C-alpha cells in the first residue's frame, strides 16, 4: 500500500483509493509508519490477528450488506470530522457509517444481517467515546448508551465512556474499531441506542 495502513484501507479512509475487486494480491507490503491510519484517534482491536488472517487471504470483493439509506430514522451524512478531509472538506470513512441523532431523537437500532453468500465475510464496525456529556447529548441525545453485537461465535456488550481526552488532530474523543468473520448462513445482530459506527460495506474472502 502507498500511504495507507490496513485499517484505513479496510475502513475506507478517504485518503486511500484501493478498492473495487482489488486484484488477487500476493500478500501486502505496508510501511510501519502508516501515513494515514484512522481519521479519528483510537484503537483498531486485534489488528494483530487480522493481519495474520489477511496473510492467508489473496482476493477481496467489497459488497454492500446494509444500505446507508436504511438508517432513515437517523442522520447518516452529518457524522463528518476534519480529522480526515476528502478534498479539504471534512469527511469520514466510506465503508462504515457514523449515525447521529435526527431532530433530538436517536431511535434504538436492532437489526440483523445474514451472510447469504458462499464466502465468509469480513465485517467491520466501531464505537464512539464522546468527549463530554455535552457532545454526547449533542450527537446522540441519550446520555446512557450501549452497543450490542452478536454472531454464533461472538458476543459484544459495550458501554461507551464519557471522558475528555488529550486532543489528537483537534478532537478529544476516540473511536475503537472491531472486526469479525461471518460464516455463510450465520447472522450478525446489531443493537444500539447511541455511539454506534455501523457497517455498510463488508468483504467477501476465500482463504488458501
Amino acid at each position, epitope marked *: 500500500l502507498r500511504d495507507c495502513s490496513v485499517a484505513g484501507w479496510l475502513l475506507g479512509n478517504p485518503m486511500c483509493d484501493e478498492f473495487i475487486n482489488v486484484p488477487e494480491w500476493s500478500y501486502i507490503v505496508e510501511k510501519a509508519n502508516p501515513a494515514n491510519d484512522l481519521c479519528y484517534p483510537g484503537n483498531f482491536n486485534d489488528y494483530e490477528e487480522l493481519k495474520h488472517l489477511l496473510s492467508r487471504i489473496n482476493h477481496f470483493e467489497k*459488497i*454492500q*450488506i*446494509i*444500505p446507508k*439509506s*436504511s438508517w*432513515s*430514522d437517523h442522520e447518516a451524512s452529518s457524522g463528518v470530522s476534519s480529522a480526515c478531509p476528502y478534498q479539504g472538506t471534512p469527511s469520514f470513512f466510506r465503508n462504515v457509517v457514523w449515525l447521529i441523532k435526527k431532530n433530538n431523537t436517536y*431511535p*434504538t*437500532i*436492532k*437489526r*440483523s*444481517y*445474514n*451472510n*447469504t453468500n458462499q464466502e465468509d465475510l469480513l465485517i467491520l464496525w466501531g464505537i464512539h467515546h464522546s468527549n463530554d456529556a455535552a457532545e454526547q447529548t449533542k450527537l446522540y441525545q441519550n446520555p446512557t448508551t450501549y452497543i450490542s453485537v452478536g454472531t454464533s461465535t461472538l458476543n459484544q456488550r459495550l458501554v461507551p465512556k464519557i471522558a475528555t481526552r488529550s486532543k489528537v488532530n483537534g478532537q478529544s474523543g476516540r473511536m475503537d474499531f472491531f472486526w469479525t468473520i461471518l460464516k455463510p448462513n450465520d*447472522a450478525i*445482530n446489531f443493537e444500539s441506542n447511541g455511539n454506534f459506527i455501523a457497517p455498510e460495506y463488508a468483504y467477501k474472502i476465500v482463504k488458501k
Partner: antibody
Amino acid sequence: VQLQESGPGLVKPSETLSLTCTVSGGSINSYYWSWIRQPPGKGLEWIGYLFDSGSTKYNPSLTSRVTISVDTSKNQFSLKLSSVTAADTAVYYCARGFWGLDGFDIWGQGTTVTVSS
Amino acid sequence: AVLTQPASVSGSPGQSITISCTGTSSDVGDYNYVSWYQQHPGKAPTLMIYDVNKRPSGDSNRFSGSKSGNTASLTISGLQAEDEADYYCSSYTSSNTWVFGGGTKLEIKR
C-alpha cells in the same frame, strides 16, 4: 415460520382499516416486517415496513394515512390505514425479510378487505 | 413508482423465456436487491430469486436472474406447464422503500 393476517374484511368509507399480523414459530426481533396489498386483478403495491426497534418507512403515496406498529410481547405487528376509500379494497399481505435477503421471504396468506357501506 | 415489465410473455413447453424489469438509478441500478416473485391467483406470491441472482431452493433450479444497467431480467429454462403464473420484480430504493414492477403474465403456448 408462519405469518397470519387478522382483522375485519369489510370497512365503511372514510373509516380506518385495522389489521394485525401474528408471527408463529419465530421472533419479531432483528427482522424487518412489511405490509403489501393487491387490489383485485391488479399488481402488488408496497405499503411500508417496520424495522429496528420500532422505526417505520411508508410508501410516499400513502404515508399520511398509514401507521405500522409492533408489539414484541405478543409477537405481532399491525397496520392502520385511515380515511379509506374504494381504492383501498385489496388483498393485504404481511411479510418478513432481513438484510442479506433484501426482499420478502415469508408471506402471510393474505386477507381480503372491502371498503363499502 | 412502478417498475416496467411486459404485461405478458409467451413460450412453448421446453423452451427458455425471459422477463425484463426496468427501473432507474435509485433502485434497480444502484443496488443489488432485486427479487422476483411468482404468484398463482388466490395465493400469496412466492420468492423465487433474491439479490439479483440467488435461489432460495431447488424450486428455482430452472430460474435465473441477472441485471444490466437499470434493467433486471429473469430467465426460465425448460418451460413447464406449471410455470404459468404472474411474475413480479421488486427493488429496494434509495428512499428506504421497496417498489414492485407491474407484473408479467406468463402464457404457455400449446
